[PDB]
Design an enzyme around this catalytic site. Sequence first.
Site, PDB file in Angstrom:
ATOM      1  N   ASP B  65      -7.904  24.046  35.114  1.00 37.83           N
ATOM      2  CA  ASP B  65      -7.129  24.431  34.839  1.00 37.83           C
ATOM      3  C   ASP B  65      -8.531  25.659  35.934  1.00 37.83           C
ATOM      4  O   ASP B  65      -9.087  26.506  34.796  1.00 37.83           O
ATOM      5  CB  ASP B  65      -6.588  25.220  34.058  1.00 37.83           C
ATOM      6  CG  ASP B  65      -5.963  26.750  34.169  1.00 37.83           C
ATOM      7  OD1 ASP B  65      -6.722  27.533  34.758  1.00 37.83           O
ATOM      8  OD2 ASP B  65      -5.741  27.362  32.693  1.00 37.83           O
ATOM      9  N   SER B 142      -6.840  30.271  55.336  1.00 36.92           N
ATOM     10  CA  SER B 142      -5.906  30.706  56.372  1.00 36.92           C
ATOM     11  C   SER B 142      -6.236  31.809  57.142  1.00 36.92           C
ATOM     12  O   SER B 142      -7.090  32.297  57.173  1.00 36.92           O
ATOM     13  CB  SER B 142      -5.329  31.470  55.141  1.00 36.92           C
ATOM     14  OG  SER B 142      -4.275  32.333  55.129  1.00 36.92           O
ATOM     15  N   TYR B 155      -3.175  39.210  49.065  1.00 34.75           N
ATOM     16  CA  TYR B 155      -3.564  37.657  49.235  1.00 34.75           C
ATOM     17  C   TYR B 155      -4.795  37.475  50.373  1.00 34.75           C
ATOM     18  O   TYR B 155      -5.480  36.764  50.482  1.00 34.75           O
ATOM     19  CB  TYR B 155      -1.719  36.850  50.036  1.00 34.75           C
ATOM     20  CG  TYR B 155      -1.761  35.688  50.410  1.00 34.75           C
ATOM     21  CD1 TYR B 155      -2.676  35.055  49.893  1.00 34.75           C
ATOM     22  CD2 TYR B 155      -2.213  35.778  52.391  1.00 34.75           C
ATOM     23  CE1 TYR B 155      -2.524  33.503  50.525  1.00 34.75           C
ATOM     24  CE2 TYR B 155      -2.093  33.881  52.840  1.00 34.75           C
ATOM     25  CZ  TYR B 155      -2.385  33.300  51.391  1.00 34.75           C
ATOM     26  OH  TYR B 155      -2.757  31.550  52.572  1.00 34.75           O
ATOM     27  N   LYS B 159      -8.752  35.515  50.730  1.00 38.50           N
ATOM     28  CA  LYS B 159      -8.940  34.713  51.764  1.00 38.50           C
ATOM     29  C   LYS B 159      -9.820  34.749  52.513  1.00 38.50           C
ATOM     30  O   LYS B 159     -10.463  34.133  52.985  1.00 38.50           O
ATOM     31  CB  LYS B 159      -7.402  33.687  52.834  1.00 38.50           C
ATOM     32  CG  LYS B 159      -6.687  33.899  51.932  1.00 38.50           C
ATOM     33  CD  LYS B 159      -6.893  31.641  51.514  1.00 38.50           C
ATOM     34  CE  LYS B 159      -6.106  31.113  50.744  1.00 38.50           C
ATOM     35  NZ  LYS B 159      -6.579  29.449  50.133  1.00 38.50           N
TER      36      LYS B 159
HETATM   37  C1  EST Z   1      -0.796  33.225  56.136  1.00 38.50           C
HETATM   38  C2  EST Z   1       0.048  32.114  57.291  1.00 38.50           C
HETATM   39  C3  EST Z   1      -0.437  32.003  58.392  1.00 38.50           C
HETATM   40  C4  EST Z   1      -0.666  33.230  59.233  1.00 38.50           C
HETATM   41  C5  EST Z   1       1.460  33.570  59.338  1.00 38.50           C
HETATM   42  C6  EST Z   1       1.199  34.534  59.922  1.00 38.50           C
HETATM   43  C7  EST Z   1       0.816  34.503  61.087  1.00 38.50           C
HETATM   44  C8  EST Z   1       0.623  35.482  62.537  1.00 38.50           C
HETATM   45  C9  EST Z   1       2.192  36.356  62.634  1.00 38.50           C
HETATM   46  O1  EST Z   1       2.573  37.202  63.154  1.00 38.50           O
HETATM   47  C10 EST Z   1       3.057  36.246  61.356  1.00 38.50           C
HETATM   48  C11 EST Z   1       2.727  35.137  60.363  1.00 38.50           C
HETATM   49  C12 EST Z   1       3.306  35.523  59.002  1.00 38.50           C
HETATM   50  C13 EST Z   1       3.440  34.727  57.957  1.00 38.50           C
HETATM   51  C14 EST Z   1       1.717  33.939  58.297  1.00 38.50           C
HETATM   52  C15 EST Z   1       1.231  32.671  56.908  1.00 38.50           C
HETATM   53  C16 EST Z   1       1.281  32.559  55.421  1.00 38.50           C
HETATM   54  C17 EST Z   1       1.001  31.583  54.705  1.00 38.50           C
HETATM   55  C18 EST Z   1       0.097  31.102  55.850  1.00 38.50           C
HETATM   56  O2  EST Z   1      -1.199  30.481  55.267  1.00 38.50           O
END
Ligand code: EST
EC number: 1.1.1.51
Lengths: 284, 284
Positions: B65, B142, B155, B159
């Site tokens: 954990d 990410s 979120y 990151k």
């Molecule tokens: C941040 C993430 C990668 C980038 C993605 C993105 C990237 C660009 C965009 O125009 C919209 C989105 C929506 C979902 C996003 C994702 C949600 C989780 C993933 O790690």
Amino acid sequence: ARTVVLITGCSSGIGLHLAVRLASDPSQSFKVYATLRDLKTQGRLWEAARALACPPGSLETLQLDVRDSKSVAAARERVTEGRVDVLVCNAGLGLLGPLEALGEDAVASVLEVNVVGTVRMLQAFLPDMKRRGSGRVLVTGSVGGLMGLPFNDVYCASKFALEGLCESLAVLLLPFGVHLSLIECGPVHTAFMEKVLGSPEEVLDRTDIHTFHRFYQYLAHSKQVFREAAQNPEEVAEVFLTALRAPKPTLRYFTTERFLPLLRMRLDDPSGSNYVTAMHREVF
Amino acid sequence: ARTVVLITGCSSGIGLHLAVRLASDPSQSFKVYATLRDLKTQGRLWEAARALACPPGSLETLQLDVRDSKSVAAARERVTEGRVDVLVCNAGLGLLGPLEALGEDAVASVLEVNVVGTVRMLQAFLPDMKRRGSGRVLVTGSVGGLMGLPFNDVYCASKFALEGLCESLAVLLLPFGVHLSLIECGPVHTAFMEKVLGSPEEVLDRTDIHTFHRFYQYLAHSKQVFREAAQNPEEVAEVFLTALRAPKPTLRYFTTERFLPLLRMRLDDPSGSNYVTAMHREVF
Ligand SMILES: C[C@]12CC[C@@H]3c4ccc(O)cc4CC[C@H]3[C@@H]1CC[C@@H]2O
Ligand SMILES: C[C@]12CC[C@@H]3c4ccc(O)cc4CC[C@H]3[C@@H]1CC[C@@H]2O
């Protein structure tokens, strides 16, 4: 009355300097709520206020502990005008030393104060601003939130966090008429800053002789940059006013331009290699 | 024996996929410690392990954990080889919804797990790696840690935090022989991902009809990107192996190149204006 402004962390630094700068403005158009975690540190603020002869009723001090949502809500009720036009999220903590030498609670406090604290402020004040269709939030950034710095791991983590939190909100707020800007500060003349840095033995028994030796080198280099580049709080505080008055403000305002070249080579190479190499050679 | 690897958050996602990918490798050169917060979720891992016919003794599950330094230390004692060659910090939580609708504890948990959790792992495992003069730490990033995304405020904060924490350490670790790399993932095919998104009423009574309407638009757009760009966990997991095997690894590895143009316009304009405008127009 007037443009109601609320600032966090006014017991010193740019916070205190920004509150008195606003409250003492010749136009007398800002009503200022300078909040402090501990009211017993309000002395400096008041002495500075008297030094700039701030008109009575242009400055009010509230105790506000950003680590407590209950403190945040209560302070929000003390705003007699029942409105906040400009929120300045400034409260923050720094942390220096090798990652392995930092206590867990210390790391938890910097995030709690720097990041979550800003989250608690926005949750409490963002709704009303969206309902009015106007408001301005200024957040104290750092170039340490734009590039990583050795021995400031958790500090940069919290500042990088603000960059992400803010850029996200910005994309959403664009249509609501509420503006959000980050003020990217470089080093600002804080005698206490150059005196906080410096920890021999205590750090030594919680790390290795080679990391310790590197910490020393970083401190030496840090002292140089501060001396050769620290800005006057008056110069920085005025940037907050430039942002505050801009009709269509940008997401970022840089108080100095000296760190911009080092930031450019950071993107020309997304793999991060060039930067990590350049910053290591310059600091060691 | 072999190259000892320890991974966090192996109950699903790339974590689980990465553990079995390593443990089942033809060369049989990796001994894997897949940790899970709750052992009652180890089923999937074992079923996947049997599916790839992983040799007995190449995969071991430990309950770890990351929100508890006591759990982190205990798990560290279970590593019979008494050494960790590759640490993969993968455990993480996501958070969706308007900032004002997010509960304080939820925000506190994402930082605690995503950021501090990674801090707890590094404090426990970094020292030994520096003493040996070798080790590899891979962190699951990410692109949400490289650019802000509406409705993912906290979120992206967490990151962006990892990016800063890691870039700082990297500058310091360069001479110690221990490598640290971030794997920048775009969306990866997680059916659960596209099903978690979607919250009507509960969100509606904690925000305004205009933010709600925007949340809907973002969700619609999110579904499109996922469908047209989600990658196979096998493709992503293999990137972890490319980094893991690189003689001189870079600070960043991008699992996809489609999001790189949108990242470039983010630096060509340090004021953040172009980006905030482009991302708003594309998402709304
Ligand atoms: C941040 C993430 C990668 C980038 C993605 C993105 C990237 C660009 C965009 O125009 C919209 C989105 C929506 C979902 C996003 C994702 C949600 C989780 C993933 O790690
Ligand atoms: C991050 C800060 C601005 C950038 C400064 C810098 C910038 C570049 C560099 O080569 C070293 C330093 C050391 C001190 C740093 C500062 C500590 C606090 C200040 O906000």
